[PDB]
Amino acid sequence: SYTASRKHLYVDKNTKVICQGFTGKQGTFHSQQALEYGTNLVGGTTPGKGGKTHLGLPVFNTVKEAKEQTGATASVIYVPPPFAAAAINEAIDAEVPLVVCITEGIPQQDMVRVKHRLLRQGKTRLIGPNCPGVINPGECKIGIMPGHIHKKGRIGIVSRSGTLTYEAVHQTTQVGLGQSLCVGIGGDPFNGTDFTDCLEIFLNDPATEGIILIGEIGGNAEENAAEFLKQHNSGPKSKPVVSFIAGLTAPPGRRMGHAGAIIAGGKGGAKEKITALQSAGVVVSMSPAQLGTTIYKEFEKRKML
Amino acid sequence: MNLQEYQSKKLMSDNGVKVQRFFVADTANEALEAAKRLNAKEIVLKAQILAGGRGKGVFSSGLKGGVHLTKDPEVVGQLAKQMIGYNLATKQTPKEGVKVNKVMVAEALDISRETYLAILMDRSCNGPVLVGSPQGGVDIEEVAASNPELIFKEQIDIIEGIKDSQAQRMAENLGFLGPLQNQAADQIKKLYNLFLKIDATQVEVNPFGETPEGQVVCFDAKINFDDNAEFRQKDIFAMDDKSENEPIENEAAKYDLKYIGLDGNIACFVNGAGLAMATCDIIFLNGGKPANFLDLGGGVKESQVYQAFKLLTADPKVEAILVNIFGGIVNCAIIANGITKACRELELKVPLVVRLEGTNVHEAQNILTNSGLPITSAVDLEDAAKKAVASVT
Ligand SMILES: [Cl-]
Numbered sequence: 001s002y003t004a005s006r007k008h009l010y011v012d013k014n015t016k017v018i019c020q021g022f023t024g025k026q027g028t029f030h031s032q033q034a035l036e037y038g039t040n041l042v043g044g045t046t047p048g049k050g051g052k053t054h055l056g057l058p059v060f061n062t063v064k065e066a067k068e069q070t071g072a073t074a075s076v077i078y079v080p081p082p083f084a085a086a087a088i089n090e091a092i093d094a095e096v097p098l099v100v101c102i103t104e105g106i107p108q109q110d111m112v113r114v115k116h117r118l119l120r121q122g123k124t125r126l127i128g129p130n131c132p133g134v135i136n137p138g139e140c141k142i143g144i145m146p147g148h149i150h151k152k153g154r155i156g157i158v159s160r161s162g163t164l165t166y167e168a169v170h171q172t173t174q175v176g177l178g179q180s181l182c183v184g185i186g187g188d189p190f191n192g193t194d195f196t197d198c199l200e201i202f203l204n205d206p207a208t209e210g211i212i213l214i215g216e217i218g219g220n221a222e223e224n225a226a227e228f229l230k231q232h233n234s235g236p237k238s239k240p241v242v243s244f245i246a247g248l249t250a251p252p253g254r255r256m257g258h259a260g261a262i263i264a265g266g267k268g269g270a271k272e273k274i275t276a277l278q279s280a281g282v283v284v285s286m287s288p289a290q291l292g293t294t295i296y297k298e299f300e301k302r303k304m305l
Numbered sequence: 306m307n308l309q310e311y312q313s314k315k316l317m318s319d320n321g322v323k324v325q326r327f328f329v330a331d332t333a334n335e336a337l338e339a340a341k342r343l344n345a346k347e348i349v350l351k352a353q354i355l356a357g358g359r360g361k362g363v364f365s366s367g368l369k370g371g372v373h374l375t376k377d378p379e380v381v382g383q384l385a386k387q388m389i390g391y392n393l394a395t396k397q398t399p400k401e402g403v404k405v406n407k408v409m410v411a412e413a414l415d416i417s418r419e420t421y422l423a424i425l426m427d428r429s430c431n432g433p434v435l436v437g438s439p440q441g442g443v444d445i446e447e448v449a450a451s452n453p454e455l456i457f458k459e460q461i462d463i464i465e466g467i468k469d470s471q472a473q474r475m476a477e478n479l480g481f482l483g484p485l486q487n488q489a490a491d492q493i494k495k496l497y498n499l500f501l502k503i504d505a506t507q508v509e510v511n512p513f514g515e516t517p518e519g520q521v522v523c524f525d526a527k528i529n530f531d532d533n534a535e536f537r538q539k540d541i542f543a544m545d546d547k548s549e550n551e552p553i554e555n556e557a558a559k560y561d562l563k564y565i566g567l568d569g570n571i572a573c574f575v576n577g578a579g580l581a582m583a584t585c586d587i588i589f590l591n592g593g594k595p596a597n598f599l600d601l602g603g604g605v606k607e608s609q610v611y612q613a614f615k616l617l618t619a620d621p622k623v624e625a626i627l628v629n630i631f632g633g634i635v636n637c638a639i640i641a642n643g644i645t646k647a648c649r650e651l652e653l654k655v656p657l658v659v660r661l662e663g664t665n666v667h668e669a670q671n672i673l674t675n676s677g678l679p680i681t682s683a684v685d686l687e688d689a690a691k692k693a694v695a696s697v698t
Contacts, residue, residue, distance in 0.1 A: 081533065108426060108506060109463075109534065112432055116431075146633030149633065161577060161578065187578060217582070246582035249582070251565070255532070256582050257578020258578040288584075288587055
């Protein structure tokens, strides 16, 4: 049911996008970038501005109206923290297929309540919060990532960080490789999409021949993914997976920037996650500068280049 | 964000959670008077610092132990005099210890049953979780390894709330009986509701117990607050002193800079928490020792590049700086200019290795390269790291 909506993650040229928090500083700036990148931003919403227009597009008071009036199959949220979970909740109630929440700062308690609702339905797929979004190189960009550094290709990339992911993407391009799709699931401890969600899509995507998983300390999503790959990416046709897990040098009990990047009560350590993934056949690049070269060698080794 | 024992015990009591009666005091006489006015058979005097381990601590006055029991109010005033204004070191504080400005004077209650009970949002469960154990008085991780069957869990439905039957079943698994079970069950509902109200990521009671006289009491407890709920938890956040925070860190926060000190000597300055951790990491992989993790955040103002730098240089232990910025949005020549402008106005005298990637990198390393300040340019992150390490060798 919730797992059904996983398919919504695969944004493409036909995905139509609306922006919640459309007239704000962040939403306006990033809707400008989406438009110049080629994304299909057709409208947006802001409280009390239904009727007005912005960036040459219609603005609505509700997502229900905009979803209806514009045919949007996806929403991106730049609504400030006190109202961002409200925003996610509204797009869920309007049954927007894909909701990308960029907004950092949403109280954790707010996300736990949003999830209760989220997991008991199957229309809406949520990525975030505190995430940079999703991008199908050349077809669609939802979020704040630099589109120009991306080049359509064969590596599906899933990640808990923003800039660290761009580093990775850049590295693949410095060795002529490409990304089929990139999902920044973000740095919060409670969110709508995890690693397993993306790996599933990557494993079933013929455009994706390799996968890069970028993780860090905190939680158990990396271990869960390790578990899913042992189970599902084994066999005469498994796809190569390369990973880098940040935070090896991180001290215990401290939030390292991301609210979810914390080692507490003996859990969340980077090495346990590396070890877990290795056991699932994941080739871990010990250095964050060698993710490009590492996955190039993997293809090279399978004569996939 | 952290609260002193007296602050959190008050917060708890104000929300129906049973805790020991207590007075707070800033001087030894106030402590003596507190103890008298308490009018109890026995009293506990406890130094107020954030770091755990007080009981096995030592004060710079000569006094061994941060927690003491006595019936004689007189002894409380005397003991307090050896604590106030002194430093208390414990296994969890730094070398020099921590200044004690206040002590708690509370009624010491006897304990017949010690149990563990916490409420947290488990990342595995998605939703609040009630974690208890009849074996209290002990580090929870320990009981889990020793007797994992003594650990009891109740998944709470955040939308329904905790059910009476969950509080009762847990109260019974903790070991409470008769009317005490009903009391424990209630204290539990109250702890859960407090958990939701103050936006805790966790409320940990230990020991969660009972007196021979018949009361269920939260003897000690620790609460972690969710930083993202600060805009709706003003009063609680205002009670945060920060007096026990690493100095550079309070300074960095002043500018929305997320700084975490490490003990190495190569400093970092990065944008993006993941990239920050990784940079501290790659430095270590190449035989270096990072001095800190520093995530500039995103809205990088010139003033922040300035403070970010001001805070790394001011650190005596810093012998070099690795700047790793991924431009994307903004174009590097801009970034490069703010780096030069700040380093000039700061007369940065320690070597700086700068790794800039994103847009206009070439020019940006020119603008950098045109400076004559101990700035060096790196082509990639591995190069950056190797250079920063060479720098301090
Ligand atoms: Cl809105």
